[PDB]
Design a protein around this ligand. Structure first.
Ligand SMILES: Nc1ncnc2c1ncn2[C@@H]1O[C@H](COP(=O)(O)OP(=O)(O)OP(=O)(O)O)[C@@H](O)[C@H]1O
Ligand SMILES: Nc1ncnc2c1ncn2[C@@H]1O[C@H](COP(=O)(O)OP(=O)(O)OP(=O)(O)O)[C@@H](O)[C@H]1O
Ligand SMILES: Nc1ncnc2c1ncn2[C@@H]1O[C@H](COP(=O)(O)OP(=O)(O)O)[C@@H](O)[C@H]1O
Ligand SMILES: [Mg+2]
Ligand SMILES: [Mg+2]
Ligand SMILES: [Mg+2]
Lengths: 478, 471, 471
């Protein structure tokens, strides 16, 4: 046996200084006497700054550090599907080891400008508001932002669950969470049956800050292994603010000078590196894709903060969740005024596009008109009609929890709303109207659903009108 | 023999230099004993906790007591183990300090009693439990809008003088008497007056002989305040694991733990964080919080008070701890000054347990309607403050008319507060409070004055108070 | 020959020690071309740029790619000249990275092609030009309020997600089709998806035959993000100087340049400035902006998108970059939330060509009347919200009613925005814009519904939409 060996100088707070290691590479893996792995970041002239990836209570000054000759790497393979695992690829669910056979570097270049193809296929989330106002396509990255206790985790769970039929792999990465919460999420996924095609990566709050800093990179490294083979991957970063805090702590412990709010200057570079790997590969690359839904947790709904703006400038679109809308009865509380999707239209099927291209703009205009016209009772006929239509649309967009809806029914209900067939139902009855409409479509007009599912286009408009009128005749106002 | 030597003394931080090849491990405990050699010295009996390895066989430690009288070059003895605290049936009915020494004047603990190290890794993923069920407390707002979870973590946020201590005392009165398991109280950075009052109250009520108490108070240096909570936690973990018994953990003002950490961190050589806090704020909190969990062997339900500096809920210490809790109640100074107690914020307070299948459809609908009306009333406040009621539409008039009554009915008269106002106080069940709120929402009491809804329970008391007032 | 070696590696900053007798000049390009001697090494082909002279024959440099795999002691070759990129007609129809290497998979540039250094002093005072000409764009708000100047510098301010990229794509589609000259695009720190979409749009339109592109695209390190813009600038400067062409220069998110500078400043060792930026912010920005001018040899007109952090125009970067522009358009989120695009602020946007002798007296009068009506409307927005619309005077009701029409008519349907709008898009001349706005001001269309004026184009489209709505 032979290996370059260093010796430790300082230990504390998960950071170690070592002497020696002449031929250590930047960003390499090292292991101490206990077998705890470590990462080398600062290659100073006299010493090397080592970042510890485990419990450092067993490391004492004077111990020996052994080089390993490998960059940071994580195991990959189909054997990870249906498992809960550390960022290092070590299982925690206690169901035995994972029989992986290859690894991928955790720091890899993103696909270039000549490798990608424009996003052109949809990602159905089963949520009416998201699928109608801010559509998401495969290869797009969409940010979910809001205050605590608003519905971000529930939205992500519903999105993952709805992918049961499509040939898509899901990856859920929990950063800085609580272990009981992670177990609860895993249990819900298992109950609804989504564990057959998903991987859970967890780095709880008890873990040292380096593992929290590395977890999203491990998740995206696991995802892109499937991406480059022609699969389709969905990745959910449970909180990037936690990663930012962990990185700030690590940098401050390494004595790097701080910037705004004690953050290191390279936080934007960190997030850009993490999020730029999502792509829609061209046909020469196999056509695989990887879509990402990072999370950001604000304070008091201040969307104009440092980390929120930094993340917003990187992603394609944002879904903004509002506490005021949440507590006023509007759930999932999508604030369509601030939400936007930069890939709209191209990420919707033909029928959905031609039915709801203008819905977001009309809803924003209705919000502004409701804000203004509240200041006076002498209202015009057009304003009254617009207010009624806006109220009915807002009532339509409400949705319960764990109730996914097929797009072939979303398009039908939104068509019925936008063509004026809902103009006479009282605002309090729209939910029951939609329930009865789905029940009636489950028996009559099944050929409409078949045609929509097959051709991805609206059926003959006469049949739509006939079916809607037939349902309205048997519909009775409460 | 392996012995040290004091090099530097900087407040609560002491440096020890050891003979080569015998450095103690991190979190070990070092002992300093020194008889005065002459009249220019004082006797010293003190203990230290290792925190860092600086190099050149030098170790940086944190003292658990005042460092006055330390002399450079004094001799330090190592123990080779972390701080150890007695556990078992011995600890029931006693009062301890951070070092595990009893202070109740009831005697001393035998030297052969089993004791366990304070520091240990958190429970693993496969050991945790997930069952959720409601813990009835008898407080209207808690039982309606944010039910408490049996076996979970509960947090109480509030500024200075808002009611956290009174709320905890009411919870102790309403739960600990009938709990039947084991209780432990760990006061951290609180008044010794309050500690003594609580001890005497428990002795009078007889709750002692099934409870243990640990006290690190305001007068202690930051070293003791950083570890008193861990001492209480390692006492509770024994009852959780080795006996499989239900454990009830009360922690008073857990914010002092992170405050003491921040105070110490400056002298350790760390650079300041955003608001002067330590860089390790998240990990230090997580290491403590992750051990308070319910496993398959047993369950711990923990109630923690959390202080909020300068009423700023965006402060990093309150902000980071929101992710470690299951049900939170946020007290508000605006409500406290208005005269409504316990001044719980009805919209900011959240709970994982408020689900239709956990509390029932009627409960869920009533809670949602109450929250909706309160949100609308909160929206109307800016216009109300200028133009008053006289410009509102007919619907908004009714919204305000009902929101005032709902808000007032959310208050209650606690048993503990009987010493402040003389009113006996009351205990209300979940079904009763749900029925009362449903009746109010249906409009069955719009003819009563709003002052009749204040500081009463069971709605029949509202009716009786209105009749007494002459309605 | 003489070589250096690597001393320190700190992220994107590398220390190199050179033998005595030869120190590379500042901004010289260094090379690292190491090969793996054994299994435990990885091949590296990396280039460096000199930044400082630290003393003792040591140089502080900045890397152009990831430094992973670097080993202390690797050999560094000095090239004796700054980074040089090919210029001329070879560049047309190609896509380059920072180092001038093609990435379009169309074949490598011949080794004998002419190359020019990136860094060069700015043009003298006596070489500049002074004439002003209006550049018609086809956008109503831009053509009316803040006209663009041919051969001048134009900036598109705005926050995140407000419309800068869409507006610049619309401008490209409007003017580059028939510009009749050379065009250059510089992708500084943007989304690779946007870059690919733009490249394929140009490939479809056929404009790619007369334009050249460079991309940094937000994932390359700050070393490359601080030089891609200068690479594009020298590519355009060759055409301006040696051929006297008329050049369009499009730079996306010039703010990324100063952002990367701030990222690398602390590691370079400079003291921090006010908001965390580098002290050399103003001079670094000036040494780049001053090179983009129009001289007697030729004229370059540049359109630059400037990102405003946190929607705050008082941030140092926008504050200092305002002084370098002739005509500016300010985008704000308030108009974006109302659903009107391109959401150009009709107040903050200014142009130095807005003079009676340049655009016409009637044009100036219409612009001033529109601006004063909108300013008057902006002042009533506060009192209206809590005093109602009725309490205003009759004339103020009229100005509000007409200002709503003006504000809604300032929007336009873009060809590029077809995905987001479902409409083909329209192009409208200055004469139509001014005549329509004059008519709206004079009140010829007070009867038409408010909702009919948005995303239309001409007043003929306004009246047709109103008629189709049933009026
Ligand atoms: N239709 C709904 N959509 C979303 N959440 C809902 C809905 N109905 C009820 N809820 C409840 O709202 C709460 C908010 O959901 P969730 O916990 O996912 O939010 P979050 O902001 O992502 O959480 P956290 O900040 O704790 O990570 C949950 O308790 C959920 O059960
Ligand atoms: N339920 C209540 N009924 C009546 N008065 C109350 C109630 N709760 C609090 N108070 C009043 O407010 C005071 C707050 O006392 P408490 O010790 O609970 O405050 P605290 O918010 O925990 O503050 P501190 O930081 O001082 O511990 C009480 O002494 C009492 O005067
Ligand atoms: N002229 C426009 N017409 C319609 N929508 C627009 C227009 N400009 C911007 N948008 C909206 O903004 C989004 C694109 O914003 P973008 O220009 O990428 O922001 P940024 O300027 O920060 O890059 C699109 O999803 C679109 O909905
Ligand atoms: Mg959540
Ligand atoms: Mg108190
Ligand atoms: Mg952009």
């Amino acid at each position: 046996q032979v290996s370059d060996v260093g010796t430790v100088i300082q230990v504390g707070d998960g950071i170690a200084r070592a002497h020696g290691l002449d031929n250590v590479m930047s960003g390499e893996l090292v292991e101490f006497a206990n077998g705890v792995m470590g990462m080398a970041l600062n290659l100073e002239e006299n010493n090397v700054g080592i970042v510890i990836l485990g419990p450092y209570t067993g490391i004492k000054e004077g111990d020996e550090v052994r080089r390993t000759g490998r960059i940071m790497e994580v195991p990959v393979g189909e054997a990870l599907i249906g498992r809960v695992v550390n960022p290092l690829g070590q299982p925690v669910d206690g169901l035995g080891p994972v029989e992986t056979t290859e690894t991928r570097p955790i720091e890899s270049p993103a696909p270039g400008v000549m490798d990608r193809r424009s996003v052109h296929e949809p990602l159905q989330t089963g949520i009416k508001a998201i699928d109608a106002l801010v559509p998401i396509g495969r290869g797009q990255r969409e940010l979910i932002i809001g205050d605590r206790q608003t519905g971000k985790t529930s939205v992500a769970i519903d999105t993952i669950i709805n992918q049961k039929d499509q040939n898509m792999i899901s990856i859920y990465v929990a950063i800085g969470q609580k272990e009981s919460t992670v177990r609860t999420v895993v249990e819900t996924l298992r109950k609804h049956g989504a564990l057959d095609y998903t991987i859970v990566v967890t780095a709880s709050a008890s873990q040292p800050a380096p593992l929290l800093f590395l977890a999203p990179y491990a998740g995206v490294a696991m995802g892109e292994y499937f991406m480059y083979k022609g699969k389709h991957v969905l990745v959910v970063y449970d909180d990037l603010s936690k990663q930012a805090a962990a990185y700030r702590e690590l940098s401050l412990l390494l004595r790097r000078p701080p910037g705004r709010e004690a953050y290191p200057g390279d936080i934007f570079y960190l997030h850009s590196r993490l999020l730029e790997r999502a792509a829609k590969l061209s046909d020469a690359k196999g056509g695989g894709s990887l879509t990402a839904l990072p999370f950001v947790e604000t304070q008091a709904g201040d969307i104009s903060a440092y980390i929120p703006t930094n993340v917003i400038s990187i992603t394609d679109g944002q879904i903004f969740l509002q506490s005021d809308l949440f507590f006023s009865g509007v759930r999932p509380a999508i604030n369509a005024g601030l939400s936007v999707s930069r890939v709209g239209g191209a990420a919707q099927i033909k029928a959905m596009k031609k039915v709801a291209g203008t819905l977001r703009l009309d809803l924003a205009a209705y919000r502004e008109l409701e804000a203004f016209a509240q200041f006076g009772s002498d209202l015009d006929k057009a304003t009254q009609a617009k207010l009624a239509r806006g109220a009915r649309t807002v009532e339509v967009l409400k949705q319960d929890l764990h109730q996914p809806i097929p797009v072939e029914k979303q398009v039908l209900i939104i068509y019925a709303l936008t063509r004026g067939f809902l103009d006479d139902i009282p605002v309090e009855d729209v939910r029951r109207f939609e329930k009865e409409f789905y029940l009636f479509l489950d028996q009559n007009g099944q050929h409409l659903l078949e045609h929509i599912r097959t051709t991805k286009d609206l059926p003959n408009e006469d049949d739509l009108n006939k079916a809607i009128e037939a349902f309205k005749k048997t519909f009775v106002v409460s | 023999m392996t012995r040290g030597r004091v090099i530097q003394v900087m407040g609560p931080v002491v440096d020890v230099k050891f003979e080569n090849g015998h450095l103690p491990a991190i979190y070990n405990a070092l002992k300093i004993q020194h008889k005065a050699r002459n009249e220019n010295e004082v006797d010293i009996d003190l203990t230290l906790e290792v925190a860092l390895h600086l190099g050149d066989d030098t170790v940086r430690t944190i003292a658990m007591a005042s460092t006055d009288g330390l002399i450079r070059g004094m001799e330090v003895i190592d123990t080779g183990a972390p701080i150890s605290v007695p556990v078992g049936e011995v600890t029931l009915g006693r009062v301890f300090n951070v070092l595990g020494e009893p202070i109740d004047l009831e005697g001393d603990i035998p030297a052969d009693a089993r004791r366990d190290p304070i520091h240990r890794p958190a429970p693993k993923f496969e050991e945790l439990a997930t069952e959720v069920e409601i813990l009835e407390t008898g407080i209207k707002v808690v039982d309606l809008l944010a039910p408490y979870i049996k076996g979970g973590k509960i947090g109480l946020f509030g500024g200075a003088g808002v009611g956290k201590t009174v709320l905890i005392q009411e919870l102790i009165h309403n739960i600990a008497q009938e709990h039947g398991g084991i209780s432990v109280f760990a006061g951290v950075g609180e008044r010794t007056r309050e500690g003594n009052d609580l001890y005497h109250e428990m002795k009078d009520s007889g709750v002692i002989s099934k409870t243990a108490m640990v006290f690190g108070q305001m007068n202690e240096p930051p070293g003791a305040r950083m570890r008193v909570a861990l001492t209480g936690l390692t006492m509770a973990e024994y009852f959780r694991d080795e006996q499989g018994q239900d454990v009830l953990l009360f922690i008073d003002n857990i914010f002092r733990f992170t405050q003491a950490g921040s105070e110490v961190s400056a002298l350790l050589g760390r650079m300041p964080s955003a608001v002067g806090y330590q860089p390790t704020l998240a990990t230090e909190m997580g290491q403590l919080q992750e051990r308070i969990t319910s496993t398959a062997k047993g369950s711990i339900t923990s109630i923690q008070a959390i202080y909020v500096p300068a009423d700023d809920y965006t402060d990093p210490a309150p902000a980071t701890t929101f992710s470690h809790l299951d049900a939170t109640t946020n007290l508000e100074r605006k409500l406290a000054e208005m005269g409504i107690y316990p001044a719980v914020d009805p919209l900011a307070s959240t709970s994982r347990a408020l689900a239709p299948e956990i509390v029932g459809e009627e409960h869920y609908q009533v809670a949602r309607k109450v929250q909706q009306t309160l949100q609308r009333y909160k929206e109307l406040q800016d216009i109300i403050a200028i133009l008053g009621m006289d410009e509102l539409s007919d619907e908004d008039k009714l919204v305000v008319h009902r929101a005032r009554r709902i808000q007032f009915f959310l208050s209650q008269n606690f048993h503990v507060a009987e010493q402040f106002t003389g009113q006996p106080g009351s205990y209300v069940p979940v079904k009763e409070t749900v029925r009362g709120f449903k009746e109010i929402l249906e409009g069955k009491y719009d003819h009563l004055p709003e002052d009749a809804f204040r500081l009463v329970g069971r709605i029949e008391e509202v009716v009786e108070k209105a009749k007494a007032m002459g309605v």
